[PDB]
Amino acid sequence: NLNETGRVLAVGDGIARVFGLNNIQAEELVEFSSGVKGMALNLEPGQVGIVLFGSDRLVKEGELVKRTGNIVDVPVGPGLLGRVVDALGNPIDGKGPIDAAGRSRAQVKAPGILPRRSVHEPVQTGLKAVDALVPIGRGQRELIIGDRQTGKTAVALDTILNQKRWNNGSDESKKLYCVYVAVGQKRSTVAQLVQTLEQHDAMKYSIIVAATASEAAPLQYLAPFTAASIGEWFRDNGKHALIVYDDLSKQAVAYRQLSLLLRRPPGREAYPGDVFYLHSRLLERAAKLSEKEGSGSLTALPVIETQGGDVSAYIPTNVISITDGQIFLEAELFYKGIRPAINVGLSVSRVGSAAQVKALKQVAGSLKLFLAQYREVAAFAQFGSDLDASTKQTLVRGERLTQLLKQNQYSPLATEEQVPLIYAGVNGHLDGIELSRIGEFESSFLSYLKSNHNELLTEIREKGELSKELLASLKSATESFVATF
Amino acid sequence: GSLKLFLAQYREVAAFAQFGSDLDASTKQTLVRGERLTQLLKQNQYSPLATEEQVPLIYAGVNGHLDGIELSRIGEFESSFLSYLKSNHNELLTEIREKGELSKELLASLKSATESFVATF
Amino acid sequence: LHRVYREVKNRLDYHISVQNMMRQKEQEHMINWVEKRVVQSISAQQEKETIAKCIADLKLLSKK
Amino acid sequence: STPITGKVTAVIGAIVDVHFEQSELPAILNALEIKTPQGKLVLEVAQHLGENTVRTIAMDGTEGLVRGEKVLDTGGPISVPVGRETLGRIINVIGEPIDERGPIKSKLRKPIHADPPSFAEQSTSAEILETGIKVVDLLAPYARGGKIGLFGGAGVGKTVFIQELINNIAKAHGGFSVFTGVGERTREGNDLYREMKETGVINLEGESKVALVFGQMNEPPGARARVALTGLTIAEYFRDEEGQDVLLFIDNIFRFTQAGSEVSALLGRIPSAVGYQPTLATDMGLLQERITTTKKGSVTSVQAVYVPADDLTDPAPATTFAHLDATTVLSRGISELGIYPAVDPLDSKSRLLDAAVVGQEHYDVASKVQETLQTYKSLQDIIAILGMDELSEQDKLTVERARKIQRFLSQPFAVAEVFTGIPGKLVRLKDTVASFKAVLEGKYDNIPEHAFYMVGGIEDVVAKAEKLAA
Amino acid sequence: KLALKTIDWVAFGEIIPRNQKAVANSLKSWNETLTSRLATLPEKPPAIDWAYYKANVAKA
Ligand SMILES: Nc1ncnc2c1ncn2[C@@H]1O[C@H](COP(=O)(O)OP(=O)(O)OP(=O)(O)O)[C@@H](O)[C@H]1O
Numbered sequence A: 001n002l003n004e005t006g007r008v009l010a011v012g013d014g015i016a017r018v019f020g021l022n023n024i025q026a027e028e029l030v031e032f033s034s035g036v037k038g039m040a041l042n043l044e045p046g047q048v049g050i051v052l053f054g055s056d057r058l059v060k061e062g063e064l065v066k067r068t069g070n071i072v073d074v075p076v077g078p079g080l081l082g083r084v085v086d087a088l089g090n091p092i093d094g095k096g097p098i099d100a101a102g103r104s105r106a107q108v109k110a111p112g113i114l115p116r117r118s119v120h121e122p123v124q125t126g127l128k129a130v131d132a133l134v135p136i137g138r139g140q141r142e143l144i145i146g147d148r149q150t151g152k153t154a155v156a157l158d159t160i161l162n163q164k165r166w167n168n169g170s171d172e173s174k175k176l177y178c179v180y181v182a183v184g185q186k187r188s189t190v191a192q193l194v195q196t197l198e199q200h201d202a203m204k205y206s207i208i209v210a211a212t213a214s215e216a217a218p219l220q221y222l223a224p225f226t227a228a229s230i231g232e233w234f235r236d237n238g239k240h241a242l243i244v245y246d247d248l249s250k251q252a253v254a255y256r257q258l259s260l261l262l263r264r265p266p267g268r269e270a271y272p273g274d275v276f277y278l279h280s281r282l283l284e285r286a287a288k289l290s291e292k293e294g295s296g297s298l299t300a301l302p303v304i305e306t307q308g309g310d311v312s313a314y315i316p317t318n319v320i321s322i323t324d325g326q327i328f329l330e331a332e333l334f335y336k337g338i339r340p341a342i343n344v345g346l347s348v349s350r351v352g353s354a355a356q357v358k359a360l361k362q363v364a365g366s367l368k369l370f371l372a373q374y375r376e377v378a379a380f381a382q383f384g385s386d387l388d389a390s391t392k393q394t395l396v397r398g399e400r401l402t403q404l405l406k407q408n409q410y411s412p413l414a415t416e417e418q419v420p421l422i423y424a425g426v427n428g429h430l431d432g433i434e435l436s437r438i439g440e441f442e443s444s445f446l447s448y449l450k451s452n453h454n455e456l457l458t459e460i461r462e463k464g465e466l467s468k469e470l471l472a473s474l475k476s477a478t479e480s481f482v483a484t485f
Numbered sequence B: 001g002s003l004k005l006f007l008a009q010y011r012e013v014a015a016f017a018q019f020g021s022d023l024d025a026s027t028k029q030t031l032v033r034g035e036r037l038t039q040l041l042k043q044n045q046y047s048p049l050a051t052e053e054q055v056p057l058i059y060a061g062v063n064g065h066l067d068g069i070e071l072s073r074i075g076e077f078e079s080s081f082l083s084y085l086k087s088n089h090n091e092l093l094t095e096i097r098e099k100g101e102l103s104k105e106l107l108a109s110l111k112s113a114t115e116s117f118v119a120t121f
Numbered sequence C: 001l002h003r004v005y006r007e008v009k010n011r012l013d014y015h016i017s018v019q020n021m022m023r024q025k026e027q028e029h030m031i032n033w034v035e036k037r038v039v040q041s042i043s044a045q046q047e048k049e050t051i052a053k054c055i056a057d058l059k060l061l062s063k064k
Numbered sequence D: 001s002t003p004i005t006g007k008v009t010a011v012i013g014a015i016v017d018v019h020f021e022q023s024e025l026p027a028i029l030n031a032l033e034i035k036t037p038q039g040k041l042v043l044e045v046a047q048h049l050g051e052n053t054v055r056t057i058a059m060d061g062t063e064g065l066v067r068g069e070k071v072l073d074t075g076g077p078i079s080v081p082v083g084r085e086t087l088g089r090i091i092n093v094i095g096e097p098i099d100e101r102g103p104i105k106s107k108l109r110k111p112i113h114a115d116p117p118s119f120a121e122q123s124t125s126a127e128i129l130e131t132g133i134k135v136v137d138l139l140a141p142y143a144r145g146g147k148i149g150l151f152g153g154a155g156v157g158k159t160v161f162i163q164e165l166i167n168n169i170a171k172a173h174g175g176f177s178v179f180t181g182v183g184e185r186t187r188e189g190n191d192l193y194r195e196m197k198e199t200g201v202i203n204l205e206g207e208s209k210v211a212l213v214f215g216q217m218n219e220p221p222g223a224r225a226r227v228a229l230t231g232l233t234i235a236e237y238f239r240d241e242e243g244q245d246v247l248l249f250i251d252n253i254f255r256f257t258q259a260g261s262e263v264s265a266l267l268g269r270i271p272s273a274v275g276y277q278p279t280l281a282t283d284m285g286l287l288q289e290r291i292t293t294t295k296k297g298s299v300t301s302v303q304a305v306y307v308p309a310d311d312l313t314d315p316a317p318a319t320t321f322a323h324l325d326a327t328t329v330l331s332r333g334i335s336e337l338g339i340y341p342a343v344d345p346l347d348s349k350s351r352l353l354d355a356a357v358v359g360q361e362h363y364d365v366a367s368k369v370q371e372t373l374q375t376y377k378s379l380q381d382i383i384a385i386l387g388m389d390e391l392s393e394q395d396k397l398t399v400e401r402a403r404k405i406q407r408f409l410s411q412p413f414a415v416a417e418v419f420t421g422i423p424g425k426l427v428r429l430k431d432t433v434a435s436f437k438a439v440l441e442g443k444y445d446n447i448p449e450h451a452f453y454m455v456g457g458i459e460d461v462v463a464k465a466e467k468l469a470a
Numbered sequence E: 001k002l003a004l005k006t007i008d009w010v011a012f013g014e015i016i017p018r019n020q021k022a023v024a025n026s027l028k029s030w031n032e033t034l035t036s037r038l039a040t041l042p043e044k045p046p047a048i049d050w051a052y053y054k055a056n057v058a059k060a
């Protein structure tokens, strides 16, 4: 035929150049005699360059190839929940065929300027150092940047687990479906990551798009977009979906590989000029739809791995420029004990209070202050008692306020349990307590309220605010426990 | 044996005495010896030294017989000490050369040959 | 209760996953079988060397 | 037989181009052979340039190839011997015996190239592995059937380290082992082969429990880039077909990328950032994926990674971290101090570093040790600029301890006994934790620091401190 | 539906001898654990779309 078919002229490096297909579309899929499929990214006057989704051992010279007449598409809908699929959208867990409610193109245009709303729905991560300091909002793009082995996944992972508080409820505009995008991670890791969510009953509302490192590059290229659509479904239909790209760094590497092999112009660090257009066209897909559009929303938590704190690198600079805040993590802070090691100094959020519970905002507005002055007078802590009383007071707080943020992994706390801890910290009811007993303080204090002041906690959970009556009732209950302690 | 390890301690103490603080007996003792061992290692070009001439020098160093000598003295000390053995205690040099090891007896004589020379001059 | 569910559903899903695998396989050998019968159609059929010069001379033309 | 003839048409370095006939082109990753008076120069298909021309990668010395020699198609990827037949014998990349023991009688021949196990086949474990090294068993303990990584610049202690692990696991393992030397000093192999005989692991006129695969640095870029696969294939066999525990030792794994990095330019690949080839993540990926534990058998892997210019930001090292469960980073800044093995306690992490794995007591003690060593390093700017006297009572007391624990992490290996002069010492995890615990409580604030340097068990510390006093 | 003798925790704190605080602690956490657990573990499992499976089978 020559118009719907083509002959392999040359194959290699997981990229084969075919001749023919004079009617093939851009980025369209194709199928080889062997069975392995690919998509043509380069459309030259003579030949057509096509990447492979499988080993190039299957593809030979002169082999026949036929069109598919379809662009990269993936099946979306609520059937995926509790499953584990690859970039294409096939099952890999062995639970049977998937039940999708339709398909969506890998490449979807972001919502326009008009069909959006200022983020206003908080995304409780269950992390004290986060929901208090860097609040995240439904539709926001908060970036989890940090060196290797710092606690980047911990942040997201806990977030998902902290969703059992609403997903097992009845109201929908309150739930939050989680979509994790494994890119460049070995299978062993995914199999474990999945096994953790199950032991916590989180797979009930989580979607895993696995893209192991052994898989072809393009797979690791389409993974983020594939998963992107899946979540947009929820967004379009008027719901809430949280998607975590872990990690975009690996994605760029994959894409760089394809681009170089295809002999496209190499830029800074061997990345083609369209690398930024890649992530910008991905993150902008998540947002907050207006009331007319469905009030639906898609949150994005992209993960970037820096090389020795170098946030000045190419890739990171691109991502950091697009997102709407970072949760910078440092290994050093990790070693001291501060876990999760979230550098309050750098970690920021452009949305801020706009997406934070007023119950916590009333006690967090000041918490950023003390910590701020603490980092400035942190050198004094190393000197003798010759420090004046003024500065010394700061050290007393900081040591304790920093000790409170330390939260064990897999142990998210609801807002009703955060406020009481922050309120006692800010006022300074812990200053008298030893800096060694701060840990057990949280335990015994929470258990106290849930037996004597349970009525207060439940009023904060429902109202979400703190009236002058509660502020006084909470203070009295605290001073009482601190006294008996 | 731990000579390389000792020279490591020397640079450790040498950098820490940069502060300009007084040093106790320990940190100054090793500082005294470590500074001289570095001066003993200095050797002129085109002047290869046999094994029988290296052992004796290093011996008097690692032990601490040079501690009680000025730094600008280590220079001529080497040549003088060698000429001393080649004249008097030459039998020992001949045993170290052939045997290539140190016996219980060879250490005894070598020990006394060193102390005897320190007393001289 | 959850265990009974998981296990039954698990037994059910097995049949689907299997069924699905069969289909795929078969339709591999099926569309692939196409290859070897078409490599037999051109290599053989000397009258499939005439339908060669044919469709191909309809290239030079159009392009210009 | 019906073999496919071919003819060489180009020769550039380790890259040979063969020109076959129409309809007779071999798929990618197929072996080839060329008869020579000396031996056989196996080639490996790489690309299909077109026009019936294929580009291969010379598995050996390319000198002596004549423009147009006839090549014999193997008809399939490089085949290596498998089975208990390969136990106690040295094998190169091509699967030919190189120990002068005659032919290796194997019932099967399995290709070095194969797909990674299915996500379904992946099996997670949480069992701990006891080696005998304090700094490890206490901080980052290795997992049974897990992947280990020994990072470190040049001359830090990666070889001696991995060698001790063999002297404490291999004999003590009722299963089989596979050592694979990739891009290393041929002499290190020699000493190894000698020790395996002397330890009893390999018996020439008896039974053996380990196979040996070497593709050292003396070999061309072709060899060092596939020798890792050759030994992997022999391990994998005992994994699925034999269905039993297997210890895989790779040293070094960095040569796998490097070797490929040399030829990538000649294969017409635009050099990626830092000069490495674009296909870094995938290649490094298709190797580590295969090296894993399935539901058929367990495989414990100990891969030593090289760090170019003591730089961890380098792609090669950087990429390898994600394929490891337990990472043992070695710092040169620790070597120079005399403390060995120069293991970095903060930068080195583990998967089994969980309370629900190593025990609650174990975690707490380990965490305390880490926090102590951290503050120590944090006050390094005060101990030189203001002295030790300026530090607070809580600080000085901590600092002293941090110095004792630091020196207490050092341990004499029976392998490097020729370096330290002190007899190897193997400490048990049960005693290890009990030792630091005691030191963390201040029960030995009287004992001198030099009593913790190069010492095994905690009892030896007290014994040593008493022997010095004499 | 369960009966669950209501419990004020500060009293519970105040009735344990010290040599028994250990026990009491573990008793508290188990309770909390257990509670969290039931918040997430639904009474019954999802139903089973029998029609669908009936719709895609092969053995009768
Ligand atoms: N909040 C926490 N509390 C206690 N331990 C933690 C916490 N967060 C992370 N860890 C520890 O971190 C290790 C893994 O860290 P994590 O996976 O968060 O980093 P990462 O961003 O995934 O790094 P990598 O890029 O290597 O995956 C585990 O060994 C675990 O012990």
Ligand SMILES: Nc1ncnc2c1ncn2[C@@H]1O[C@H](COP(=O)(O)OP(=O)(O)O)[C@@H](O)[C@H]1O
Pocket: D152, D153, D154, D155, D156, D157, D158, D159, D160, D161, D340, D341, D411, D412, D413, D416, D419, D420
């Ligand atoms: N247990 C030890 N104690 C002291 N020094 C050691 C020890 N192990 C190794 N070394 C030092 O490291 C050197 C060998 O380095 P090697 O293991 O080859 O490092 P690399 O893996 O970087 O090549 C030895 O010469 C020795 O001086």
Ligand SMILES: [Mg+2]
Pocket: A152, A153, A246
């Ligand atoms: Mg991660």
Ligand SMILES: [Mg+2]
Pocket: D158, D159
């Ligand atoms: Mg080495």
